[PDB]
Design a protein around this ligand. Structure first.
Ligand SMILES: O=C(Nc1cn[nH]c1)[C@@H]1C[C@H]1c1cccnc1
Lengths: 416, 553
DNA sequence: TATCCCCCCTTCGGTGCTTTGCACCGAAGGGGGG
């Protein structure tokens, strides 16, 4: 029995008090069945009304699975959980995981159930199961073990996880392993067959350890080697109209905050006359010179962009139509870290909320692999429809912190 | 003999102490009445006397809202509520009868003084102490406490809900055929049993509630239909709002208008077609709360429409789990819509109105997306399922809007129903400049220190007009320039603004806005045939941008 | 000169750039029903 580790909080800042969003009937049924079974096994014990604490709860059916898995939002608890960032239980980030042929994820979340939680801090994991039509009051409950989603659960489980990881890591130094929340990120430079065989071995090792001391057969693949930051490229053309010339000047201005090397003076001189937009302006020698030099600069990769460990990550998203999205992770509004683009998927060709959900999941997974801090999203969606429909297509097990934006960027600068 | 109910601990604030305040003297009659009631409750057992061992107390006042002069007693628990363990009331949503299921036999139980049956905390009775002056304050006061849950206290409803749930959970486990919804005082019980078997079950439940000492008077216990339940008269096959009457005033003041608005909104749950927008329009600009606001023609027309709808009573129906929820929306105009959540033709299950103005520049499609969102969330809360909308919008318009708008939107499921006034895009802009149109270069400039500025346009052919105006902000100078450029040319026109703010409105495609300027621009843009706008970096020597900038400098 | 919950309006106060006017959220207080 792992002895309990006392956990403190921020001085003079109370715990989580968040309202419960309404849920559908099937999700409520699955949630109540899971909670009753977990009480039968002693993981959760019913709690009284004296608790001034609550966190939401959602039921999500994960990929290639048919039974729902209870997900409890823990963002407020994570943000207010102090000292856990500076406690040495935090994981150093392997800088070699960005460059690997394949990465596989595992559902090692259930392994956290076997460690008892600190009793003094225990009052903060309260959660309510709502009722349909307000027939009955909230069926309140409380974990008795390590929760799934708290930033301190993997931190406390570091010792027992390392006691299992070191034999495998010692045997095979090639494989690099990282852990964020309930997820094990494991990758290698081997081919598909060798990677799958080694991952089988690893899962067998974990299962045998569990035997000796929502589906456990799930597996998701990732390929970090197919990610490239995409510089913006100017349109290729030889016959130019006034409208196209001026909109390219606009794009050069749009790129003037990214780089200091773009020169616009000559092409501004080309537009001294007040001609009609449809009028055709053949390009001149100086105009071609500036255009070619600027295109070379844009091809030249960005410089001056660097990571700062003490700052947050921001992941803007712009909708570009026809199921095309973009994203720009950064820490300071000019020095973009990693841009990108998410093409359309299959099955979501008529669902913008679904497409944004998949984009969120793919951005977060990427950023976790690259750096290990999830980015603070800036979603281009309506808050109420998001809160109403994000659950039905979400299939991850961790939730980032997002803020919404309502002012239109009105930019095709990133859309090529 | 009796079955006790275990307490639930409470505490004050750490570092902060309890309530030490006193009230002011009341009327001698009210004081005597309260004293009698308190002595009666003492000899009943709820209230015990307080000696010198509890020095500080809490003030108590007298109210007469119940009946006329009932001398109903309530205590000023303000300081206590300011200083005790904050609670989390988990049951806050009020039930709606639409979701009730058609039980063949129904009975409503009402618990009398059940807030007083549950006990209190021993430690906190010292802080739950109150004192009443003697008759006409001959003696300074008689000091009391509560060995039961006080009426009007932070945690009273929470603790009562928890206690009643604890009591009724065994009974619910006993029988999976009987449904027992409860909100605070009421205890609706319903089942598909026979007329005698259900009565026997209710009798046994009542005895089971007398086991812990709860009392339910037979007079309040309903016997035959109809059953009046928390404001909704529940007939066997039709819920209905308890009938209400609106004031027939001829000098309508602000609070009378507000009461009219409130009762109309409350009755909107079942009566289809109630409108309150122009009626509420009177409330804008609060100056004096005593005078009488004249009823304008629009207000009186809306009021007459509400009255003529309210003349006849209409009844809803209970939900039936074996059928599929279908909703509908009609566009009343000016920003008002209607709900017809039903399951069978011409059998409503609910009705409502959406009238919130979200955004200073929005249009019909966005407001129909906020309408269906509200229907969806309320349907989730009340039923657990999302209904099948019957939208007025047309598939082509919805596709052309959602594939091209910059945010992300989604409407669950619907089929287009042909019923005017339809929602459609009034004007669709252009993305590429056309061949056979002019070109307007517009620009607005003004100074904050001058409160005046000049705006104008310089087309390709040399036409120029600089119209000076004052008191109009810069974003407004630009908007004016776009207005001039629209007014000057013909059905087709290419307009090249240099302002970043301006283009957002026009591209958003509004049909209505707070600003008259924007409303004029909308009128012009509907009138024109093919309009293309364009942005240009300001102050970069780009064609006529600086040419007109120098003039408006 | 009592408490607490849903909902419906309007007023003013904070945000963010949308740059300082403008759009856009958040409670305060107004009524309806418990
Ligand atoms: O629960 C109720 N139902 C009811 C319907 N009509 N009249 C009464 C009582 C109104 C609520 C109450 C009021 C003040 C303090 N605590 C509780």
């Amino acid at each position: 029995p792992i002895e309990t580790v006392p956990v403190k909080l921020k001085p003079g800042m109370d715990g989580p008090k968040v309202k419960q969003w309404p849920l559908t009937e099937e999700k409520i049924k699955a949630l109540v069945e899971i909670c009753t079974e977990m009480e039968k096994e002693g993981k959760i014990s019913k709690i009284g009304p004296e608790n001034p604490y609550n966190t939401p709860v959602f039921a999500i059916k994960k990929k290639d699975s048919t039974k729902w898995r209870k997900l409890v939002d823990f963002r407020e608890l994570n943000k207010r959980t102090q000292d856990f960032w500076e406690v040495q239980l935090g994981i150093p980030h392997p800088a070699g995981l960005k460059k690997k042929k394949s990465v596989t994820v595992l559902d090692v979340g259930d392994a956290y159930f076997s460690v008892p939680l600190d009793e003094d801090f225990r009052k903060y994991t309260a959660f309510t199961i709502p009722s349909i039509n307000n027939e009955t009051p909230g069926i309140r409950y409380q974990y008795n073990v390590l929760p799934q989603g708290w930033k301190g659960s993997p931190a406390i489980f570091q010792s027992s996880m390392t006691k299992i990881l070191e034999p495998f890591k010692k045997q095979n130094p090639d494989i690099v392993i990282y852990q964020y929340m309930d997820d094990l990120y494991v990758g290698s430079d081997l081919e598909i067959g060798q990677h799958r065989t080694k991952i089988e071995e690893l899962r067998q090792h974990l299962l045998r350890w569990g035997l000796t001391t929502p589906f456990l057969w799930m597996g998701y693949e990732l390929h970090p080697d197919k990610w490239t930051v995409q510089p913006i490229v100017l349109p290729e053309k030889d016959s130019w109209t006034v409208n196209d010339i001026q909109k390219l000047v606009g794009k050069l201005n749009w790129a003037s905050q990214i780089y200091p090397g773009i020169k616009v003076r000559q092409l501004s001189k080309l537009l001294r006359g007040t001609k009609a937009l449809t009028e055709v302006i053949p390009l001149t020698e100086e105009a071609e010179l500036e255009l070619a030099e600027n295109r070379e600069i844009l091809k030249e990769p960005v410089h001056g962009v660097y990571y700062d460990p003490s700052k947050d990550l921001i992941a803007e998203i712009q909708k570009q139509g026809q199921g095309q999205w973009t994203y720009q992770i950064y820490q300071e509004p000019f020095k973009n870290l990693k841009t990108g683009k998410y093409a359309r998927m299959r099955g979501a060709h008529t669902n913008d909320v679904k497409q944004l959900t998949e984009a969120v999941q793919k951005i977060t997974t990427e950023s976790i692999v690259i750096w290990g801090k999830t980015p603070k999203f800036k979603l281009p969606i309506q808050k109420e429809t998001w809160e109403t429909w994000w659950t039905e297509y979400w299939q991850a097990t961790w939730i980032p912190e997002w803020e919404f934006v309502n002012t239109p960027p009105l930019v095709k600068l990133w859309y090529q | 003999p009796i079955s006790p109910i275990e307490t639930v601990p409470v505490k004050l604030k750490p570092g902060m102490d309890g309530p030490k305040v006193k009230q002011w003297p009341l009327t001698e009659e009210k004081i005597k009445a309260l004293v009698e009631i308190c002595t009666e409750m003492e000899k009943e057992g709820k209230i015990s006397k307080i000696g010198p061992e509890n020095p500080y107390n809490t003030p108590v006042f007298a109210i007469k809202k119940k009946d006329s002069t009932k001398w109903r007693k309530l205590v000023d628990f303000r300081e206590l509520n300011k200083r005790t363990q904050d609670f989390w009331e988990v049951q806050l949503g009020i039930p709606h009868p639409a979701g009730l299921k058609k039980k063949k036999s129904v009975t409503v139980l009402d618990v009398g003084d059940a807030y007083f049956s549950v006990p209190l905390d021993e430690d906190f009775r010292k802080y739950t102490a109150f004192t009443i002056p003697s008759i006409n304050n001959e003696t300074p006061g008689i000091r009391y406490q509560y060995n039961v849950l006080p009426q009007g206290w932070k945690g009273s409803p929470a603790i009562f809900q928890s206690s009643m749930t604890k009591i009724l959970e065994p009974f619910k486990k006993q029988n999976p055929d009987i449904v027992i919804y409860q909100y605070m005082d009421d205890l609706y019980v319903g089942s598909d049993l026979e007329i005698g078997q259900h009565r026997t079950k209710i009798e046994e439940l009542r005895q089971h509630l007398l086991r812990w000492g709860l009392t339910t008077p037979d007079k309040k216990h309903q016997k035959e239909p109809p059953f009046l339940w928390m404001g909704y008269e529940l007939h066997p096959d039709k819920w209905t709002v308890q009938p209400i009457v609106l004031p027939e005033k001829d000098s309508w003041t602000v609070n009378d208008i507000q009461k009219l608005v409130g009762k109309l909104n409350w009755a909107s749950q079942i009566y289809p077609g109630i409108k309150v927008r122009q009626l509420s329009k009177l409330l804008r600009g609060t100056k004096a709360l005593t005078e009488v606001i004249p009823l304008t023609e629009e207000a009186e027309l809306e009021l007459a429409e509400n009255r003529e709808i309210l003349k006849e009573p209409v009844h809803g129906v209970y939900y039936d789990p074996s059928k599929d929820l279908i909703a509908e929306i009609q566009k009343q105009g000016q920003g008002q819509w209607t709900y017809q959540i039903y399951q069978e033709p011409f059998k409503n299950l609910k009705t409502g109105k959406y009238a919130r103005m979200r955004g200073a520049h929005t249009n019909d499609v966005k407001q129909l997306t906020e309408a269906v969102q509200k229907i969806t969330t309320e349907s989730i809360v009340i039923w657990g399922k999302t209904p099948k909308f019957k939208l007025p919008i047309q598939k082509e318009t919805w596709e052309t809007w959602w594939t091209e708008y910059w945010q992300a939107t989604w409407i669950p499921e619907w089929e287009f129903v042909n019923t005017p006034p339809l929602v459609k895009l009034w004007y669709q802009l252009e993305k590429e400049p056309i061949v056979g149109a002019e070109t307007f270069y517009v620009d607005g400039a003004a100074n904050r220190e001058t409160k005046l500025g000049k705006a104008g346009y310089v087309t390709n052919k040399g036409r120029q007009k600089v119209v000076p105006l004052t008191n109009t902000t810069n974003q407004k100078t630009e908007l004016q320039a776009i207005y001039l450029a629209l007014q000057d040319s013909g059905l087709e026109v290419n307009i090249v603004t240099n302002s970043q703010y301006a283009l957002g409105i026009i591209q958003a495609q509004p049909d209505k806005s707070e600003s008259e300027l924007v409303n004029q621009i909308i009128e012009q843009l509907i009138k024109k045939e093919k309009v293309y706008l364009a942005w240009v970096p300001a102050h970069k020597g780009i064609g006529g941008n600086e040419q007109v900038d120098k003039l408006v400098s």
